[PDB]
Amino acid sequence: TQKAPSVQVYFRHPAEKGKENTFHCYAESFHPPKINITLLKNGIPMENVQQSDLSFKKDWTFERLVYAKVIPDGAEFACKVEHITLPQPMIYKLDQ
Amino acid sequence: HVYGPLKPI
């Protein structure tokens, strides 16, 4: 009945230095819906962050999208997810 | 359009 988040991080386009992009962190398949999702650039929370409304699937598990505009350069992007099923916060690093 | 008023459970 408690279910842990399945999480995924990605850019809208494959990165390019100086070319503006959108960084996303997406969580799904979790329960209860309380969840905290923080976009990190080099470990520091990003500013100007947006988050979608809370919806769920036909199996009742919740979904949440979190994103922010950003300009890549050769600087690290990650996502910190906290949830009742996660005893420690879990960081999802974006590669490429 | 949302559904109208609901009844007690």
Binding site: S6, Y10, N36, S52 | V2, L6, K7
Partner: protein, 270 residues
């Protein structure tokens, strides 16, 4: 290849991150009731077209959505009693909507869940309620006997919901029925002694897509993993698919992608 209108309502009793009410046409969100706003709000430009004929659309939906929020607070309190729970954090969820298929047949559903498990749902075809357990049989009672209200729901699911869905599809056809071409990129991960070939497929719409790694042209699933199909903020989708491939054997593997945006399927190698 059908279309649907879908509402998703979520109520939590002890607080968090704190009511939620979202409306979709074909997984495009078009309205939401911001439990902060206490207003049912537009989420896309095309839904304002409802205002010429129905200038009261936003007030009516707001009053109803507010009504549902108050009802859900009551529901959460009653279910604590039904399940005799002194009281922790609990969840009540409601999903309902209709489906209009391409053959002009239709379907609909109307379902409630307590703490993420089914609680009760309406069977439109028998006009009775399916309780998931013996506490829900309390609810099955009152509701099985409310013949008139049960018919409002059948009418809503079979007619009212379909009529709005058909209005919405015309209102928002330019974005609801668009296609965006997948963007397929193959990368290669480790030099040091097998390689993982990654196929990134992004920027596609609608959501439905067929991605497979092939080997000498044939679909291949050994040592093949895949990501979530996840939404970009511009309403487009993203995912990936990987395969572990062999020394000296890279050229046998291609990432095969089929989608409405591709008149012909694409096959991408490293």
């Amino acid at each position: 290849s059908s279309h649907s209108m879908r509402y998703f309502v979520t109520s939590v009793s002890e607080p968090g991150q704190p009511f939620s009410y979202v409306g979709y046409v074909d997984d495009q969100e078009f309205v939401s009731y911001n439990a902060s706003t206490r207003r049912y709000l537009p989420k896309v430009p095309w839904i304002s077209k409802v205002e010429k004929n129905d200038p009261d659309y936003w007030e009516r939906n707001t009053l109803y959505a507010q009504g549902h929020e108050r009802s859900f607070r009551d529901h959460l309190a009653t279910l604590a009693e039904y399940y005799n729970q002194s009281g922790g954090l609990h969840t009540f969820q409601w999903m309902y909507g209709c489906e209009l298929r391409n053959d002009w047949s239709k379907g609909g559903y109307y379902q409630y869940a307590y703490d993420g498990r089914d609680y009760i749902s309406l069977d439109k075809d028998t006009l009775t309620w399916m309780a998931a357990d013996v506490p829900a049989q309390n609810t099955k009672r009152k509701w099985d006997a409310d013949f008139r209200d049960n018919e409002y729901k059948k009418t809503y699911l079979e007619e009212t919901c379909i009529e709005w869905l058909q209005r919405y599809l015309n209102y928002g056809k330019e974005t609801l029925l668009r296609t965006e071409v997948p963007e397929v990129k193959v990368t290669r991960k480790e030099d040091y002694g097998m390689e993982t070939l990654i196929c990134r497929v992004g920027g596609f719409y609608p959501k439905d897509i067929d991605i497979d790694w092939t080997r000498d042209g044939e679909v291949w699933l050994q040592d093949v993993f895949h990501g979530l199909v996840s939404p970009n903020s511009d309403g487009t989708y993203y995912t990936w698919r990987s395969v572990k491939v062999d020394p000296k054997e890279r050229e046998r593997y291609k990432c095969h992608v089929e989608h409405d945006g591709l008149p012909n399927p694409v096959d991408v190698a490293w």
